[PDB]
Design a protein around this ligand. Structure first.
Ligand code: K
Ligand code: K
Ligand code: K
Ligand code: K
Ligand code: MG
Ligand code: MG
Lengths: 120, 129, 160
RNA sequence: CACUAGGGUAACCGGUGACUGGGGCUAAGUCGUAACAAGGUAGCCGUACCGGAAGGUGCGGCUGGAAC
RNA sequence: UCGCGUGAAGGAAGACAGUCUAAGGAUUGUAAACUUCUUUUAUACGGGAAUAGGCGAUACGAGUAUUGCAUUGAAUGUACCGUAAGAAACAGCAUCGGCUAACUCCUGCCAGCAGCGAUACGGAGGAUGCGAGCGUUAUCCGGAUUUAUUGGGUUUAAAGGGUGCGUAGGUUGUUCGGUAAGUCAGCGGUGGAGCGCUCAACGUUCAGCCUGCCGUUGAAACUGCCGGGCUUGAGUUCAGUGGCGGCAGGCGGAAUUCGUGGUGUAGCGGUGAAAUGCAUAGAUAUCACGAGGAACUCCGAUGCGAAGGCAGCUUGCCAUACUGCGACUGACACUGAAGCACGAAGGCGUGGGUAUCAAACAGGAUUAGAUACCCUGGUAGUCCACGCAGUAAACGAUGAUUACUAGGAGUUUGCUCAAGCUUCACAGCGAAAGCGUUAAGUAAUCCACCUGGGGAG
RNA sequence: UCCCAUUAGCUUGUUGGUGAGGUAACGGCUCACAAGGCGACGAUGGGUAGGGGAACUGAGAGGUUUAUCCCCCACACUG
């Protein structure tokens, strides 16, 4: 545009959206397991364990449960962090293992800190 | 016309691109000063002023090597839509000192070298190299 | 561009270039090579052979055949220069003596093959290797030495 | 004089509601074949009328169309 | 965040793990054998942070002695025995990237991406980073030029308003003087080298920017303002040359529709083939008379208009264009957010008219079906006047103005020249197709618009 | 010295004059003629922020944010 056009109007800059809006600019939130169910991936064909959780920030979302073997159930207090799964539409949050009701993965000897397992 | 100095630079550039030997311009005082600066700085072969019934004509014979012109780029800086003013302490260097910038100053019209020598600033008309 | 017809070889990139035929897919092998002696002479070529070594050898031969002379002084450039070729644009500026080459990739390969030590280089177009190396060599070719500028203009004490 | 308290009408910001309609994604179960080749009636734009559905037809325009 | 330690020098290829019955990796790694203590422990000495009655005498300031005064606190530090003794995790090793064997699973799983579901999943052995930390999540910057003044674009990727007139605003040919608002200059005011931490983070001092604001002196090239000039831009006049430019009034022939009458009788019409339909209470065809509506063959591909658009003949009233003058005035110019005007077809309201064609609707065919394509009918509409409405592939998918830059082939008008009209084609531009004096080339002024796809105009 | 025109008119001590009172002090600060003033250089109305140096971060253009520190402002359950 011309210099006078820029003087009259100016330039407008948008705002980048946050990839985890339900956290409300927090690292982790606390919730209760409203529902525990299983979903199918959008060329994978697995059975991924998910929980619908109502967070304390007045919001309900879906959180994936990483690892093999979950002791969670309905109406369980869990810690929810960011991070999405590529081959699953919907879910965009993870459940921290080893915190609150969620227990660490049993029989883990590698990648222990990502699944909350102590040194054996 | 909107910018006669830009028109003069454009005429020179088009003649250089077309590979002509001479170029004619409707005369003006600041353009007479600019072509005098160019001739004494060694970018054109020679010039001539013809004062006719109109405002006058400037005829410029350009400088070619034994077929590359002596001028490579002309860039108008201070346009009517955005005027550029600078001092001697912040004057620019064109092509890292191998090119010139025509500057209008209260002491007259000269290049950036003479302007920095005389410690004066003004309008930056064009970059020439 | 002055043609100016031992230089080491640098492989910029290779490509898995395919073809579609009724029988199936036939695959070639392309490679961009730059030859230079770190002195002011740099050439570039494109080998298009079946095997990788054969493609590299053909590119080396083509780059040796097509050479130009780039005016340089010490390990820097006489002035700043911008040049665009295709969807790629390059900008080169002189820098301080203790700075080195500040760019990576095809730009770094071309500037190493030409031997320039201190340079500030920035790419403002695309990351295509062909157009990138061609734009960089065009920028180097459009570069004028102070002696060349003085010869074109007249006197050699113009900078004073 | 005004801090409140009281009635009433007017705004704005908000919840909920018998019932009633879009959109996105995942499944794809059903029904046809509208477009991509002259896609088997060249295609598209506007407008009007009419159909389970993609759509059809009338009038004007375009080639981002064949073929002559 | 910074610093230190978890030991230092020699010791051949133990036992136990892996991968191949031996060989290779762990591996000089362990085990003993020789020294050192930073640091931990037990003891002693233990700083620094603490500095603040006479004797001039101006009779009081002020300068000189003495006195106690440490929460931190066994705290720095110094010294003494007897000992390697008390002290290493976490991540990832298929590409981007540094780092590979074997067993599982063949869903369980993993992922930042190419994706694998394994030199990608889980374990075991080795490897590679970093290291008292290592990873995961959340937030903010740069690469991003992904808002582009520096520093992007709009033919076909997103992006030129349907077209003009015009208000505010932005820009301003040439020249002679004034002024000093912008601009420039001067003078004032104001706001790396050491030293100490045992080293370092960190403390601290001086050289060094103040380049932001204000005051006060000067300069006049350029922009602005004021006062005059010039004619090249712009406009007015005159002459010549136009034209499917607008509005309005008249005049026409061909075809075709209906009504009424001559001739005449076995079909006509339609289709790929048929049928629905008209027709012996008298068709098609053919000859007349009477009443009407709509469209303008040949010329006819070119010209005009701001765009939408404009084509039978003629007249009237308007507008407008192009070329020139030795006629005039003197920069009176360009663009233009708001606003206003015009604006194809279809559509709406009131009054006329109503021949052809024809949405909707009705019947006949083809198909598995045919809510279509084909055929026969057929009402709005199509026509006129006035008024609404304001849309289009309203397209050159390309805004207006000004100046400049190569050649070929045609064409119209004004006379070899200048306007216009379209396709090949230098330089240049472009991602390419391509554009190329009617630019999408080189430049300047203003306006409009774009910032991933759906949702969604 | 922030956004919104899917915020276009606002104000009636509001603008000015005379006089008086009041104040540490000028003044519609208050009290007894003319009528004005302010707005497309954004009045008015609505939403959201305490403001700077710092700090972080970009070659630069700059930008982000006031965690410790310093300067100014506002407040002390609500009037
Ligand atoms: K079809
Ligand atoms: K069709
Ligand atoms: K049209
Ligand atoms: K062409
Ligand atoms: Mg487009
Ligand atoms: Mg247009």
């Amino acid at each position: 545009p011309t210099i006078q056009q820029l003087v009259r109007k100016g330039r407008e800059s948008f705002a980048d959206k946050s990839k985890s809006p339900a956290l409300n600019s927090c690292p982790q939130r606390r919730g209760v397991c409203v529902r525990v169910y299983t979903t199918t991936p959008k060329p994978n064909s697995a059975m991924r364990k998910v929980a619908r959780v109502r967070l304390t920030n007045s919001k309900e979302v879906n959180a994936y449960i990483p690892g093999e073997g979950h002791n969670l159930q309905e109406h369980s207090i869990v810690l929810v962090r960011g991070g999405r799964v590529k081959d699953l539409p919907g879910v965009r949050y993870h459940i921290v293992r080893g915190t609150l009701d969620t227990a660490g993965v049993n029989g883990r000897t590698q990648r222990r800190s990502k699944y909350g397992a102590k040194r054996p | 016309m909107t910018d006669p100095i830009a028109d003069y630079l454009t005429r020179l550039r088009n003649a250089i691109m077309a590979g002509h030997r001479v170029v004619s311009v409707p005369a003006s005082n600041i353009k007479k000063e600019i072509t005098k600066i160019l001739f004494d700085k060694g970018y054109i072969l020679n010039y001539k002023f013809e004062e006719n019934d109109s405002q006058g004509i400037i005829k410029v014979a350009l400088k070619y090597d034994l077929k590359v012109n002596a001028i490579k780029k002309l860039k108008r800086v201070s346009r009517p839509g955005l005027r550029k003013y600078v001092g001697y302490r912040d004057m620019p260097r064109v092509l890292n000192g191998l090119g010139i910038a025509i500057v209008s100053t209260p002491r007259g019209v000269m290049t950036d070298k003479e302007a920095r020598e005389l410690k004066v600033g003004g309008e930056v008309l064009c970059y020439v190299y | 561009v002055y043609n100016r017809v031992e230089l080491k070889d640098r492989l910029v990139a290779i490509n898995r270039v395919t073809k579609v035929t009724k029988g199936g897919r036939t695959f070639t092998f392309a490679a961009i090579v730059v030859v230079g002696n770190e002195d002011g002479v740099i050439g570039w070529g494109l080998g298009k052979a079946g095997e990788v070594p054969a493609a590299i050898a053909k590119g080396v031969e083509a780059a040796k055949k097509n050479l130009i002379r780039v005016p340089v002084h010490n390990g820097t450039i006489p002035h700043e220069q911008a040049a665009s070729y295709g969807g790629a644009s390059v900008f080169l500026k002189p820098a301080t003596t203790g700075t080195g080459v500040k760019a990576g990739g095809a730009m770094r390969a071309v500037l190493d093959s030409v031997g320039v030590t201190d340079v500030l280089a920035k790419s403002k177009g695309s990351s295509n290797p062909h157009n990138l190396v061609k734009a960089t060599i065009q920028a180097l070719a459009e570069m004028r030495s102070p002696l060349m500028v003085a010869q074109n203009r007249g006197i050699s004490v113009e900078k004073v």
